[PDB]
Amino acid sequence: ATLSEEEIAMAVTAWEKGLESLPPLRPQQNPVLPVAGERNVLITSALPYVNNVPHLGNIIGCVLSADVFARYSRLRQWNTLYLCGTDEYGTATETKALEEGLTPQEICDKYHIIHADIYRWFNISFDIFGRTTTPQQTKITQDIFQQLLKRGFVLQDTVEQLRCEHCARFLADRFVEGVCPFCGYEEARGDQCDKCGKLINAVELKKPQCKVCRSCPVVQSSQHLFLDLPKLEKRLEEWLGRTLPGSDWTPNAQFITRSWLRDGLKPRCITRDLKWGTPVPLEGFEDKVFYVWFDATIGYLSITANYTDQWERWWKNPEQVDLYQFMAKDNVPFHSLVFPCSALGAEDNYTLVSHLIATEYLNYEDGKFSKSRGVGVFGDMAQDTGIPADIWRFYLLYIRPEGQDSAFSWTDLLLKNNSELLNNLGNFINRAGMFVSKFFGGYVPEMVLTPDDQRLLAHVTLELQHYHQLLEKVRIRDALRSILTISRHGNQYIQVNEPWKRIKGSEADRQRAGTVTGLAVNIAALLSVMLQPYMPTVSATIQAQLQLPPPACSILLTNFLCTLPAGHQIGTVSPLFQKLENDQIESLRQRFGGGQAK
Ligand code: MET
Ligand SMILES: [Zn+2]
Ligand SMILES: [Zn+2]
């Protein structure tokens, strides 16, 4: 805990320079567009499937992780566009719509609102939260398809598929029964005979049956399109070899990507026999659509396009734009292989991802989230617990599954709330603001820095730079702890100086009390901005209580500044956090535990 004289003297200088170090801000732009010469940060979160209510695992892995970095990116004055939206096409949407007695468009409109409401409550600051079911999706999907077709990256072949003429549909291996051509087992599945173990193709079945209507399916050759990834594999590895090293792709994402390439890429079918999907502009495909995962990633582009005319300045400008993509592990192959191949094969100067951020999975307690069994906290339930959104944000981010899986624990939430928020972070900021309001009439006291004060000030600056160091590489988990480290330093500073005692003392002792008090609240002011990407409501609350000027609230410099000079008037202070009670938590834990199921 010992620095250099140069370190201490440098940090002090930057501090004393004050609010004059602050570039008067730039007016907010709508739409946000890339600005030449400056850093332009494009951020996408994986588009959640619309017809499933998201749980805390989904949220922390994608929208919440992306939001933290998005908010940090704005504090660094980077031109930031954070976009997301609902993934809506697919067979599951047709199955769920029918089950709910609605049209696919109806059930999508319904659940899109549910998603948006959940993300609003969690305070996810999307610049756009769009939809994949738009005319612009069809247009952009078809264009990219056309660019790939004429360059010979699309194959066309026929597939023998069992079709039930009564159900008027092609059958999945799990919907077809039949007798085994290898052992004669009369009730074999289309995928496997459980009797002799043989892995089969459904068409090999004798006397096939549709397990829905029990009719006899007939073999039909249907036309299908394919993306020739083997022909695109070369240019994909050239791009990967150019961009992976020195990047901040999460280790798991890199491994998965290189792992798929080690096997070798295969031709992927990009068409489906469906009605709900982006239509294929080709002869004889009037009743087929693009496969969801072929154009779901194109949704990123179409969502941006519904937002602005100049969407190609973001998505076709790799020289000015650094793309960050946040997703879960299972989404990586589509973002690191499928879409890059499609984009590179289209040869339209596309912005490709620079840093892929893929998290491990968040477990609920000792198991997994399950709407089926009533286990776990889902996004629509979190609003009803009496626990504020920022408390959810803090804890989920404190245990964000980066290197390995993590598990949500009600017991741990209570401990971390009471220890880190109440008895640490909140305690420091409460005392800081309280001392100004009580001892100095709400005016920040004069600050006469001792050598020990300069050390603290320099230590705070180093933690701030460490904080920057981490969040610059999307180390969200560790930067949060950096915040708590500064706060823990501040509590020690207050405790040893005992300003609330010294204030009732000699001429000299009252000056020390004021210096400590003033420096403390300037640290509090800094903490509020650092906390902004994590707990935006509390951040604003602190800034309201301290009346921190809007320009100081909008930027985070790499140096600890004096944002509250001597004579600055603060507002009215009030305890930041509430204690979490044991009875309160046991009740919530029993509610989401599964033992109260139906
Ligand atoms: C274009 S990202 C789509 C991700 C998909 N909706 C999922 O939840 O896995
Ligand atoms: Zn068999
Ligand atoms: Zn049938």
Swiss-Prot record:
Lineage top rank: taxon: Eukaryota
Gene Ontology molecular function: any one: tRNA binding
The keyword Ribosomal protein appears for this protein: no
Cysteines engaged in disulfide bonds, as pairs: none
Modulation of this protein's activity: Enzyme activity is increased by spermidine, EEF1A1, and when the Mg(2+) concentration is increased from 5 mM to 13 mM (in vitro), possibly by promoting the dissociation of the complex between the enzyme and its product.
Residues holding ATP: K371
Protein's UniProt keywords contain NADP: no
The protein's Enzyme Commission number: 6.1.1.10
Mutagenesis / variant outcome for changing R400W: In SPG70; uncertain significance
One record GO biological process: cellular response to platelet-derived growth factor stimulus
GO cellular component: aminoacyl-tRNA synthetase multienzyme complex; cytoplasm; cytosol; extracellular exosome; membrane; nucleolus
Catalytic reaction annotation: tRNA(Met) + L-methionine + ATP = L-methionyl-tRNA(Met) + AMP + diphosphate
Signal peptide limits: none
Subcellular location: Cytoplasm, Cytosol; Nucleus, Nucleolus
Motif ('HIGH' region): 48-58
Motif 'KMSKS' region: where in chain: 368-372
Family: Belongs to the class-I aminoacyl-tRNA synthetase family.
Function summary: Catalyzes the specific attachment of an amino acid to its cognate tRNA in a 2 step reaction: the amino acid (AA) is first activated by ATP to form AA-AMP and then transferred to the acceptor end of the tRNA. Plays a role in the synthesis of ribosomal RNA in the nucleolus.
Quaternary structure and partners: Monomer. Part of a multisubunit complex that groups tRNA ligases for Arg (RARS1), Asp (DARS1), Gln (QARS1), Ile (IARS1), Leu (LARS1), Lys (KARS1), Met (MARS1) the bifunctional ligase for Glu and Pro (EPRS1) and the auxiliary subunits AIMP1/p43, AIMP2/p38 and EEF1E1/p18. Forms a linear complex that contains MARS1, EEF1E1, EPRS1 and AIMP2 that is at the core of the multisubunit complex.
Known disease link: Interstitial lung and liver disease: An autosomal recessive, life-threatening disorder characterized by respiratory insufficiency and progressive liver disease with onset in infancy or early childhood. Clinical features include failure to thrive, hypotonia, intermittent lactic acidosis, aminoaciduria, hypothyroidism, interstitial lung disease, pulmonary alveolar proteinosis, anemia, and liver canalicular cholestasis, steatosis, and iron deposition.
Protein name as it appears in the record: Methionine--tRNA ligase, cytoplasmic
Organism: Homo sapiens
